[PDB]
Amino acid sequence: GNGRFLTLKPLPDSIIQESLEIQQGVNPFFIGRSEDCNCKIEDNRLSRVHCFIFKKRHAVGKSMYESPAQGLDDIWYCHTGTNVSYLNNNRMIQGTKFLLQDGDEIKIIWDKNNKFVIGFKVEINDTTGLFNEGLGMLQEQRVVLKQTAEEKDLVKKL
């Protein structure tokens, strides 16, 4: 497991039923109808750079003792699609970032009328020196944040 850290597995319940794994070294992982997206999702509704999972160095609030957390890396899910995505219970519009916890099932597209639903389960097998792995530590904070020029630049690579 010197190449895979995170595992995004499209479930059978979704039009997709494959397993994609982000490499501890691949950051950010791009998702969208365009295979250019490190992750592959073919949904007529999905866009080229539908969304991407980006990794960042988790910063701690100092420590005048011996406590965990420290400074390591965290994986953020960055939605770039107009069709919006659903993560557990948090909405993310094209241009948002989100914390990805170990075993996080994210839905990129859900249509009731079409009965077609897409969702991937994030499973981290390897922890490339991750403060935890991505599920955070103490008081889970699952709130959607906005992206900046840094994020927009990442999608400008493919």
Binding site: R45, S47, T82, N83, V84, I109, W110, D111, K112
Partner: peptide, 7 residues
């Protein structure tokens, strides 16, 4: 085609 919309 950024004219999509979901319920």
């Amino acid at each position: 085609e950024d004219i999509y919309y979901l319920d």
